[PDB]
Design a protein around this ligand. Structure first.
Ligand SMILES: [Ir+3]
Ligand SMILES: [Ir+3]
Ligand SMILES: [Ir+3]
Ligand SMILES: [Ir+3]
Ligand SMILES: [Ir+3]
Ligand SMILES: [Ir+3]
Ligand SMILES: [Ir+3]
Ligand SMILES: [Ir+3]
Ligand SMILES: [Ir+3]
Ligand SMILES: [Ir+3]
Ligand SMILES: [Ir+3]
Ligand SMILES: [Ir+3]
Ligand SMILES: [Ir+3]
Ligand SMILES: [Ir+3]
Ligand SMILES: [Ir+3]
Ligand SMILES: [Ir+3]
Lengths: 120, 120, 120, 120
């Protein structure tokens, strides 16, 4: 589970999620989006259930990226909420919320879904 | 902005969000939910736009809580995505996704909205 | 309940929702948005639980507006999902999804929340 | 487009969506869910952009089902918001909100995503 989550993951858009799962429930790493107003890697942090169902069938987790790095600032942040499912074709299945700051409040949040796998 | 976000916040359900905004864009703290399968404080981590619009009118941010502490484990995680709005009646306006692990995938994610203020 | 829902409602943005609840569970009417790429009235249709909890404490309902009328076409559609709560300060509390067609799939859907009341 | 949408569609859960797209932008039909507190067919209604991009590359649409029929009442309603994409492998790509009435307001709305195809 700690072991299952730690590593490099890829979504359906070609984005790359590099994460380390801590014994304490921490997620730390970097995110590189293949799309949008983004380039290179962005810091992420999050949390996961460090004592889930032992069958690896669904470990709840989430993380945040703020879209500011040394190259760009998109004045926005995405949070992903989902679960890690272990096994031969391990997956992290997520839904996400992307909020844009000021750069029309009602129109400030996009929603979508990303599925991450261990192979691109 | 760093200064604006750091502190104790309260939502409409009576929950308490204690956060420190780092110069580096980190959010760290604790969350206590007034509702659901939760008691006492849970670790949170997140990110915020550390170079936003300078008028404090909308700073993008997000954070995650995994609902495991030393009292309980609800095998779930919530992510909040939103923006900090400064001024006399400072607010963090969020939308959230709560994913439940295994404890029916299609029915695993709740969505809602929380508005945080500096006074309860 | 049929009686409770039928009528004119107003949200926090100043939009106007005019609806008739049918005995058969139909919702029919018009929507005028105070915001976005919209003017005048748009057709809506939806459904509601025509045999809910009798205390009026929470009747599930939803409706759709496609943002095409004789004035404009924003090539988009919004769906509202929520519940009608009766009583002295009757409310329809909703969450909404706004999808934009082609005019970047991942960025095609906004999410938000609207609270409707019988007085503006 | 009218022609493209009208017909029987199937999602990844094995649910069946039967719809007629009207010249006027109406969607009418029946929905049968393969999952949840549901059996047999439920009435749906919705709307679609009846003058979209002519390449069939993304027509915005939405619909509602209230989960009451002559067999069951789940005191809930789902709205789907998405777009129809034409071509050899035609699709309706949606995100959905399912609200439950009274049967804990904060926990009343599920969110997910369904992809409909013309073959099961
Ligand atoms: Ir999914
Ligand atoms: Ir800027
Ligand atoms: Ir998708
Ligand atoms: Ir999917
Ligand atoms: Ir809001
Ligand atoms: Ir458990
Ligand atoms: Ir609310
Ligand atoms: Ir609000
Ligand atoms: Ir609400
Ligand atoms: Ir157009
Ligand atoms: Ir709001
Ligand atoms: Ir609210
Ligand atoms: Ir999608
Ligand atoms: Ir009932
Ligand atoms: Ir899925
Ligand atoms: Ir998908």
């Amino acid at each position: 589970d700690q072991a299952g989550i730690t590593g490099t993951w890829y979504n359906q858009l070609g984005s790359t999620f590099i994460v380390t799962a801590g014994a304490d429930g921490a997620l730390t790493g970097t995110y590189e989006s293949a799309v949008g107003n983004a380039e290179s890697r962005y810091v992420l942090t999050g949390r996961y259930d460090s004592a889930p169902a032992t069958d690896g069938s669904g470990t709840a987790l989430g993380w945040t990226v703020a879209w500011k790095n040394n190259y760009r600032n998109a004045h926005s942040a995405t949070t992903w909420s989902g679960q890690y499912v272990g096994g031969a074709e391990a997956r992290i299945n997520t839904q996400w919320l992307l909020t844009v700051g000021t750069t029309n409040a009602w129109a400030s949040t996009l929603v979508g879904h990303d599925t991450f796998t261990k192979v691109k």
